Design a protein around this ligand. Structure first.
Ligand SMILES: O=C(O)c1ccccc1NC[C@@H](O)[C@H](O)[C@H](O)COP(=O)(O)O
Ligand SMILES: [Cl-]
Ligand code: NA
Ligand code: NA
Ligand code: NA
Length: 234
């Protein structure tokens, strides 16, 4: 199977942020039109705990035909309830959720494939720590947590290097490899794609566990179009 591409629509104040703003419905519909397998839909306000865009996010999901991965501040019963209640295929439980490790284990049993766990990674003196984007504190060691979630039956991981996210500086192929080598759960890469060559680079890891790649900035920078990226990975 070819690498999956998930175009990213990040919502702030009820508009898609790309610094330019515009309709989030339209952005997602346009990506689906260009032939998106999935949309990665993000409530940035909810991720930073600063606001909420559920009602708008529920609209976006209801209007699309394609698979939607929902993400942003998904951290507890209420936040997980509203996310699943949009009818999205998948929700992305944020790194910040790891503050309550048993909540994570409990919701993994309850929801199974509907749940992915976000791993936002920062190398600190060589060490792979977890530090949620939008979160104020450290969330533990990557490998200790990846192992724990793998034995708890985690169905998929979303792996970000917080230092490459939105930077167009290339992905962290060491991190993508390291994670995937350590688990049979599908891995979705997020952050730092600059080119079609990066996609192709990510695609080489499909075989050891990287099924997909989320792309935001390189699409809005017009570095490549979606059908181009779809071609290159096939
Ligand atoms: O996706 C999330 O859950 C999240 C949470 C807090 C802060 C940022 C977040 N993600 C924004 C995200 O959708 C980025 O656009 C993707 O990681 C794409 O990376 P980019 O291609 O822009 O380098
Ligand atoms: Cl989340
Ligand atoms: Na992540
Ligand atoms: Na970054
Ligand atoms: Na990317």
């Amino acid at each position: 199977m070819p690498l999956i591409l998930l175009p990213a629509v990040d919502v702030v104040e009820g508009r898609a942020v790309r610094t330019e703003y515009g309709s989030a419905v339209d952005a997602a519909l346009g990506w689906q039109r260009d032939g998106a397998e999935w949309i990665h839909l993000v409530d940035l306000d909810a991720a930073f705990g600063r606001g909420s865009n559920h009602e708008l996010l529920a609209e976006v999901v209801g209007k699309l035909d394609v698979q939607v991965e929902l993400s942003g501040g998904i951290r507890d019963d209420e936040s997980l309830a509203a996310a699943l209640a949009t009818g999205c295929a998948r929700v992305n439980v944020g790194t910040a959720a790891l503050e309550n490790p048993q909540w994570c284990a409990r919701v993994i049993g309850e929801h199974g494939d509907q749940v992915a766990v976000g791993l936002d990674v920062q190398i600190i003196d060589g060490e792979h720590r977890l530090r949620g984007r939008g979160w104020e504190t450290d969330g533990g060691d990557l490998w200790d947590v990846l192992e724990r979630l793998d034995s708890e039956g985690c169905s998929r991981f979303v792996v970000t290097d917080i230092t490459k996210d939105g930077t167009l500086g290339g992905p962290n192929l060491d991190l993508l490899a390291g994670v995937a080598d350590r688990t049979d759960a599908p891995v979705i890469a997020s952050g730092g794609v600059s080119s079609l060559d990066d996609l192709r680079a990510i695609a080489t890891l499909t075989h050891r566990g990287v099924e997909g790649a989320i792309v935001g900035k390189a699409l809005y920078a017009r570095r490549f179009t979606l059908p181009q990226a779809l071609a290159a990975v096939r």
